[PDB]
Every structure is written in C-alpha cells, then in structure tokens.
C-alpha cells in the first residue's frame, strides 16, 4: 500500500498525528485522503521509530509520512534509514537526502519530497538545506534547475518551506508554475491554516500542478494534547472538495 | 579490498586502462599507487560491465575506478548500479548521482567523487551536472557550499572538470583552498599532461589538500593501441615522489 490516496487524484492532506489514536481519528476525518506525519526526532533510534510507526501504519492503511522533526536537517539520515524499514507512502527530506531515501526505499512508489526555500527573488530558490550545507553560504539556483536536480535524484515533489506569508506569494506562484511545467508535484508547507488554505491552494491549482500535498501543522494542533483536531481535518477536506468542484 | 593506495598517504594517480593486460602493466608501473579507470559507456549493460570489471579488479588488487565515459551524465545510474556489484575503490559521479552511488555501495570506504565545474568566476562552481540538470540553466554556487553539499550527500571528493590544464589556474587554486579548509579531497581532471602535472599538483599541495587524485587520460594514451603507456605512469610516479620530497 505504497500509493497515497489523493482526493480526485489531486490533493492529499499531510498533518501530524499526536498518538496512534489521533492518527485513526484523522484518517476517518479525512476519508482516507491524508498522510499522517510521525517525526524521527521524537525517537531515540531507528528501531524504536520503526516499531512505533508500524502501529500508525496499521490504523491508517500505511498512510504515514516520515518526517525530520523541528526542521532539523541532522535528522535526514535517520529518516532515510527509518523509511527503508517502514516503507511509508511518504518521506520528507532535505535537498541532500532525496537520493539517499529513494535508494534505501528501493522502489519508485514512495513519495520523496525535497526541501527547498524562498530567497526573496522570484524564480530563484535555496537548495543548501542539508546538515552541513544549511550552515554555509546559501546555494541559490533557478527553480527550473532545482526541479531537474530533484528529478535527477529520484525525488517526487518539491517541499517549499517556509511559505511565510503574502511576501512570498509571488515566489510561490512561480515555483508552482515550474512544477506544473516539469510535471512535478508540490508540497506547500509553513503557516497554512483554515483561513488561507483556499487561497494558497488555488494558486497551485491555477498553475496546473498535478498533485499537491499541503502540510498543515500547528494551526490545527491542540497544544494542550499535542493532537491534530479531527474536526479541522474534516474542514480541510470540505474546502478541498469545494476547490475541485 | 576498498581502500585506495595513496603514495605517502597523499596522491593516488587515476588513469584509464585499454585492456586487462594494460591494467596489470599500469599497476606495476605505479607501484600500486594508482586507480585504473574502466568506463560504463563502453559496455551494453550493467551485467556485461560488472563481469569485465571484475577481471580488472583481479590484476590490480581492486584498484579500479568506475567511470561514466565521454563526460556523459546519462551514464550516472549505470555507474551506481555497476558499482553496487563491483565494489570498487573509486566511483566517478555527477553531482546528482553521489548519494545514490554511496547508498547502493553500502559502505563508506569507496571513494565517491562529485563533478563540479569552473564558471569563470573564482569561488563559484557549476553543480547542475546531472542528466536533466545539465540541460537546464546553470546552478552556480559558492565552492564552500558545494563541498558541504557533497559531504552531506556521502561524497569523498570534488572532481573538478573540465580544468583545461592550467587555463583555470586561479579558479582551481580557490577550489584547492576550499578543499583544504573543509578537509575534503580533490581530483583534478582535464588537460593534464606530463609537462603541466608538476605545476598543477604543486597548487593543490601548497593549498594543503590532504588527498589528491589527478586524472591523466589522453596525453598518456598510445593512439595506435588505445593503451595507457606504462612508461608515462612511471614518469608521473617519479614526478610525484619528487613533488613530496
Ligand atoms: Mg609505495
Ligand atoms: Mg601541454
């Protein structure tokens, strides 16, 4: 079960689970059109992570997204090694970890995203997002080339982060158009909430992006419990059904 | 046997072999301080290349370097799949193939190089050297960050190509400095001949690069036979001993 369940073959929500029970409720709320994020940084080692994420898999039909955790690029290798055993539907990586994860996954079905970042210049993206490279002078390249490199490395989609706000909408619209033109998928991430979901998504849909995996994290998480609100997952589904007629 | 035999733990020559017998002669002439390059493009498929490359490994104590051939990035995946089965001392890769080769090699002992190129601008390097990315607008980045990304991707060394011999002296000197400062290895490649070998190596040596693998191809190949001249290999070895005395 390696193929994510995109709604209308177009959109798959990606949200964090606070617990195995929370993952079950999110999966029901989304009618299965979702990927439940579980973060490697919440585990002391690969084996513990693997053992726990299998429990998430059992209640979501393997709709699990393995993530780095706290944006920490030093988690990249652990994510690759967990994913090799978990065989998830989705893997988050940094630019320098895309090829590793695809090689260790050993098949072409798992979605492997790659972190690239806005720069303040429409059409240019930052690709130095790895453990050591994230701390060097920025690597800034044409967004078309970034996508070609990600494709060369076995990547499935661009994870564009931090989305920020209105200041990066122009930059975002240009990344979405580049994705559509290179037939590549897109994963908007950062600051998405119930009030801006429709607008952001419409940009990617108008650009003609084929498959879109929006990441919606803290805006729908109850900080008292660490759980994603299932009622908010249902709202996102409703809005996604509306966006697509 | 996966460790290249560096002369004085500093320099190992990389030269092409025209035949298994040529490889034996080359290995003797360099007193073992060599890697013998066999090119993926010279073979019809992975299995045919793997069988032949094993014969070169026998006569050289596995001092084999799997190459792309003809500077073609479309040989990248084949080099990775070949190296997986050959387990050579040295693998040549384009930037987007470094991580894949490291992953499918399955150990950290094989040297995996990454191709980055001069740009005309001291301190900036071109890294879009993969199959699709080579056809895209250039990705030009700071040499420091390219080395950091190569490390992040499991690489051992920078392959700086095409150098045009001493035509890119000043760009090369800055790459050697960056390699020395980030403690990364360097493989000068393109236009090296017996008359400029010393001056080119002295640049990387004065910069304090810890391990250098110079690639000397056409200038020492007998065009009548296609064989690399063992007497030229011995000349390069003696020059190397004199450089480090
Ligand atoms: Mg010796
Ligand atoms: Mg000359």
């Amino acid at each position: 079960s390696l193929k994510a369940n995109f709604y209308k073959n177009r959109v798959c929500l990606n949200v964090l689970a606070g617990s195995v029970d929370n993952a079950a409720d999110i999966y029901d709320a989304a009618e299965g059109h979702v990927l439940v994020g579980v973060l490697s940084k919440n585990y002391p080692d690969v084996d513990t992570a693997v053992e726990d994420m299998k429990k998430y898999s059992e209640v979501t039909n393997n709709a699990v997204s393995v993530g780095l955790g706290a944006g920490d690029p030093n988690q990249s290798m652990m994510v690759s090694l967990i994913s090799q055993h978990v065989q998830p539907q989705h893997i988050n990586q940094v630019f320098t970890g895309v090829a590793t994860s695809r090689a260790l996954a050993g098949q072409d079905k798992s979605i492997v995203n790659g972190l690239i970042s806005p720069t303040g210049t429409v059409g240019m993206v930052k690709i130095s997002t790895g453990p050591l490279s994230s701390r060097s002078e920025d690597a800034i390249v044409p967004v078309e080339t970034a996508i070609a490199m990600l494709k060369d490395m076995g990547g499935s989609s661009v994870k564009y982060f931090p989305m920020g706000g209105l200041e990066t909408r122009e930059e975002f619209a240009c990344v979405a158009k580049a994705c559509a033109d290179k037939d590549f998928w897109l994963e908007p991430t950062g600051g998405i909430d119930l009030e801006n979901y429709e607008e952001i998504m419409q940009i990617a849909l108008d650009a003609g992006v084929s498959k879109i995996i929006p990441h919606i994290y803290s805006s729908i998480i109850d900080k008292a419990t660490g759980n994603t609100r299932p009622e908010d997952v249902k709202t996102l589904l409703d809005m996604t059904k509306k966006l697509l007629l």
Side-chain angles (χ1 to χ4, degrees), chain A residues 1-240:
Chain A
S1 17
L2 289 170
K3 290 295 255 184
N5 187 353
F6 285 84
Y7 173 76
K8 276 13 169 138
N9 299 152
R10 294 303 302 277
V11 180
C12 195
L13 307 174
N14 189 329
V15 302
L16 307 180
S19 73
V20 172
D21 188 71
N22 183 46
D25 290 347
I26 288 160
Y27 184 86
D28 292 339
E31 299 189 347
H33 306 297
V34 66
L35 291 163
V36 170
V38 196
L39 308 185
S40 69
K41 209 180 197 286
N42 290 330
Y43 299 93
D45 64 293
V46 173
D47 283 347
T48 308
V50 166
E51 186 171 317
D52 207 31
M53 297 174 187
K54 286 170 175 176
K55 293 186 176 35
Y56 290 87
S57 180
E58 295 185 304
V59 307
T60 64
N61 301 333
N62 203 50
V64 162
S65 171
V66 188
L68 281 284
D72 178 357
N74 296 102
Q75 294 299 293
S76 177
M77 177 64 76
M78 178 168 177
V79 157
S80 292
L81 293 167
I82 287 163
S83 295
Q84 166 174 35
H85 303 296
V86 173
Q87 293 291 308
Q89 283 180 11
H90 186 87
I91 301 162
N92 291 274
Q93 269 303 337
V94 296
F95 187 87
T96 56
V98 176
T100 310
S101 285
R102 171 67 63 207
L104 303 191
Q107 36 72 17
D108 283 348
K109 297 178 180 209
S110 289
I111 299 163
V112 177
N113 72 33
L115 187 32
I116 72 179
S117 295
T119 57
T121 294
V122 171
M124 303 293 291
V125 292
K126 169 201 187 218
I127 63 171
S128 39
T129 57
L132 290 175
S133 54
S134 62
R135 287 175 168 202
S136 318
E137 185 177 353
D138 293 350
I140 295 319
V141 313
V143 60
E144 305 93 339
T145 306
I147 294 169
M149 297 173 87
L150 287 171
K151 285 168 114 176
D152 280 334
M153 300 183 308
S156 311
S157 67
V158 164
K159 189 194 202 176
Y160 192 59
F161 170 92
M163 284 290 293
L166 294 180
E167 85 283 8
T168 110
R169 296 304 184 75
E170 256 176 54
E171 279 183 79
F172 177 62
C174 172
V175 166
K177 184 181 202 99
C179 286
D181 288 353
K182 291 226 37 147
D183 190 41
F184 204 57
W185 304 346
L186 178 60
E187 307 190 14
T189 307
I192 297 170
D193 63 32
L194 289 183
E195 302 96 62
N196 66 13
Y197 180 72
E198 279 160 313
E199 185 152 321
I200 285 168
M201 290 304 269
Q202 195 64 47
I203 287 168
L205 292 171
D206 289 351
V209 182
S210 179
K211 285 200 197 322
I212 310 164
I213 300 175
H215 291 231
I216 312 87
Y217 297 161
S218 51
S219 65
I220 64 167
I221 291 163
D222 176 359
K223 290 126 197 39
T225 64
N227 291 332
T228 293
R229 314 188 177 100
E231 66 275 16
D232 290 353
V233 172
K234 186 181 145 158
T235 303
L236 287 162
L237 189 63
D238 291 324
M239 290 164 97
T240 305

